[PDB]
Amino acid sequence: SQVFGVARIFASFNDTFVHVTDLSGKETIARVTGGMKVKADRDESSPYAAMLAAQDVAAKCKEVGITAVHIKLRATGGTKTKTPGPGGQSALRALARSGLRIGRIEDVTPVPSXSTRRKGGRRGRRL
Amino acid sequence: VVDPFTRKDWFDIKAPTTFENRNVGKTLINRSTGLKNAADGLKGRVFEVCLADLQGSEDHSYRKIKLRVDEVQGKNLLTNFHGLDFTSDKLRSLVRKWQSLVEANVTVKTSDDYVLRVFAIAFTKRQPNQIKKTTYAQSSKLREVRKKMIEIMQREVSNCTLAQLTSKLIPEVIGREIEKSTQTIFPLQNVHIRKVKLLKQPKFDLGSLLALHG
Amino acid sequence: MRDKWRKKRVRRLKRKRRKVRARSK
Amino acid sequence: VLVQDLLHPSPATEAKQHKLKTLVQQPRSFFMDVKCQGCLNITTVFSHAQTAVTCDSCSTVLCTPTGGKAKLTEGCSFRRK
Amino acid sequence: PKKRASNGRNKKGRGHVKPVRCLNCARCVPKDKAIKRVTIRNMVEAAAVRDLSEASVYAEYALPKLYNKLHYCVSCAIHARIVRVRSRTDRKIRTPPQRK
RNA sequence: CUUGGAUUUACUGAAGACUAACUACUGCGAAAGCAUUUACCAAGGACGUUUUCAUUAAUCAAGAACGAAAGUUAGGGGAUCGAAGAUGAUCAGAUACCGUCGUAGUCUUAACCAUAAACUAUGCCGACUAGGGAUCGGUUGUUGUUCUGACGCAAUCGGCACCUUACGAGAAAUCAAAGUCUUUGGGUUCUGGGGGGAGUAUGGUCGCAAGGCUGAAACUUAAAGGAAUUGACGGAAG
Lengths: 127, 214, 25, 81, 100
Ligand SMILES: [Mg+2]
Ligand SMILES: [Mg+2]
Ligand SMILES: [Mg+2]
Ligand SMILES: [Mg+2]
Ligand SMILES: [Mg+2]
Ligand SMILES: [Mg+2]
Ligand SMILES: [Mg+2]
Ligand SMILES: [Mg+2]
Ligand SMILES: [Mg+2]
Ligand SMILES: [Mg+2]
Ligand SMILES: [Mg+2]
Ligand SMILES: [Mg+2]
Ligand SMILES: [Mg+2]
Ligand SMILES: [Mg+2]
Ligand SMILES: [Mg+2]
Ligand SMILES: [Mg+2]
Ligand SMILES: [Mg+2]
Ligand SMILES: [Mg+2]
Ligand SMILES: [Mg+2]
Ligand SMILES: [Mg+2]
Ligand SMILES: [Mg+2]
Ligand SMILES: [Mg+2]
Ligand SMILES: [Mg+2]
Ligand SMILES: [Mg+2]
Ligand SMILES: [Mg+2]
Ligand SMILES: [Mg+2]
Ligand SMILES: [Zn+2]
Ligand SMILES: [Zn+2]
Hints:
The structure is cut from a larger assembly and holds chains A (127 residues), B (214 residues), C (25 residues), D (81 residues) and E (100 residues).
Chain A: E1 4-11, E2 16-21, E3 28-33, H1 47-64, E4 68-74, H2 86-96, E5 101-107
Parallel strand pairs in A: 1-4, 4-5
Antiparallel strand pairs in A: 1-2, 2-3
Helix pairs in contact in A: 1-2
Chain B: E1 8-14, E2 23-30, H1 38-42, E3 46-50, H2 51-55, E4 63-73, E5 76-86, H3 88-94, E6 101-109, E7 115-124, H4 139-158, H5 162-169, H6 173-181, E8 188-200, H7 206-211
Parallel strand pairs in B: 1-5
Antiparallel strand pairs in B: 1-2, 3-4, 4-5, 5-8, 6-7, 7-8
Helix pairs in contact in B: 4-6
Chain C: H1 3-24
Chain B binds one RNA strand of 238 nucleotides through residues 44-46, 48, 68, 91-92, 95-105, 123-139, 141, 143, 146-147, 150, 183-187.
């Protein structure tokens, strides 16, 4: 029936990666970031840039033959934030609204089982 | 300049016969050229596919199976079992407060010398007539449950081949046996084999793999 | 001034006194 | 309660007290006559026994020590003396 | 004077509690003192749960939730209005606010 | 840092750290502190006891053991953060806050150091004085409960706490002890005597050092300070 890729959406708070691979992830099909859609750094992670990135990703997927994708959303994780960035929701809605078919959705944010020391110092970053 | 997608050839992924829906999906690779054959660079790849897809039933939506390709037959990829894991959301939906979480792991090799690490997880069960807020088991009880988990994973892995173990894992035979075996220690709920890891594989047996492919 | 820094200033001044006295022992 | 008979407490409230907190402290333990199922031979056993007591006739353990009262083995019947 | 009988933390019958980092500023805060909130949000916003269900290849596919436990220092929480300054008598009330 | 392929993606490996979620007005320890599994080693409180000895006890100048972090000496390790330093911003200036790196350090082995808002800012032992519901460990009696264990209902001893009242205390904040204190006496150790000068100088002693412990005076000064009230203000909330 359908041909599945894997839409690996990495939504940090400074950028948004929309990366579609095969099932294994060893073959990259399309990787469009929110920074390729705007010329200002402050909105590289904007929902608008993520939507444009997703539309370009869907267009590239269609001409290669990918008709459906599984979703692996992730935040920065590690010692940094575990909540996904603002662009991951827009890239997901744009992908679903672009004619690509959606399979399983999962959050794959890296979470330590403890961890290393987090930047900022003992008193945190004072603002 | 070249459009690298004009040189991609599609292959079909075939799961072992232990599952139902053996048509995993499609992959691609650079077309076989003189310098690099597609076969050698395509075997050894690992695909992570949901067990609900491999079985049709939605009861397995929270478990995902890794299938490793180790033989190519034309445009067909012959994969093997590579590991088991729970989804992150499933584990997070199981780890509540006001209850005890008990975990165990063991390194054990199968009949065909497949070295695995098997991770078991369980939580304390609240009785229907219970009034108190929390459901905590004493650490001695948790040690007895952990020991029973370990000797059950050891027995139910060392006594069977990897294919039979996969057929045991799909219906949670081991989890049901751990839950039954720990009834006299403490009531438990959500007893699962939440992860299986391949550490070392035996020498490749194409005939044995082919028996797992029809 | 802050008591901690007042203490540090006095510690540095005791240190100087000791170093100065050591010249003539 | 301002007026109360301290010399004659109600035996109901007197029985809930700790063994050292009565007017005159008294143990709540006792001695038992244990009949093993195999034969009939009186063997006096402390209720809170710390020893795996065996009867003289047959070398069978009568009780296993626990945190509190000793636990009689199956087939062993006790009668308080 | 003493503002709180609990000294603003939850350490009684204990000597030392290992710290946690504020989610917002990465400040070291004792685990008992940190303001902790458990949030279970839908992974897809309700606006997009429709178009994503229409684009879904699965009949009766349940959208996964997002589970997270957030740790805040006192400054992070007060600034983000997670907790607010309460009156002297209202400070003692430690039941969860009746909103849900 | 990046068309010399960065960032991203899958698989594999190596290093050091660290033990998330579970995790709590819960546990343990003399305190500092202690959180992956198992084994071994030696301890410990409570409970239970119709076991044993019979005053062996309480608190303690002198004298000892342990004692967060940082720091010192010498090996080993050096992932991550990161004093100093280098650098980009902001600014009138910021060698500050913010950003990117970074050396000591962070970890470990042998030794030192002996200090923290080392806090419950509340010495230890003993007795008594008031209601209540929770909770951890042990023990003892008992269910329209699930499957022996779990749970449920009662008692109790010990803990960690909490809620109410104020007989009582307090300058008040508040306190079940901070009560049983002019109606002043259960036992005992330590400490204070207006604010500074000053934990300074000097002498001694300990330390490799940094420093620790002990520790003045001249002179100067009418307040300094505690708790609460009204207002005013706040780059605090509503
Ligand atoms: Mg601020
Ligand atoms: Mg128990
Ligand atoms: Mg204040
Ligand atoms: Mg402390
Ligand atoms: Mg852990
Ligand atoms: Mg515990
Ligand atoms: Mg003590
Ligand atoms: Mg003395
Ligand atoms: Mg002394
Ligand atoms: Mg060194
Ligand atoms: Mg500058
Ligand atoms: Mg650095
Ligand atoms: Mg060192
Ligand atoms: Mg020290
Ligand atoms: Mg001191
Ligand atoms: Mg404190
Ligand atoms: Mg003091
Ligand atoms: Mg003392
Ligand atoms: Mg007393
Ligand atoms: Mg008295
Ligand atoms: Mg109990
Ligand atoms: Mg008793
Ligand atoms: Mg009170
Ligand atoms: Mg109190
Ligand atoms: Mg004076
Ligand atoms: Mg004042
Ligand atoms: Zn007998
Ligand atoms: Zn802060």
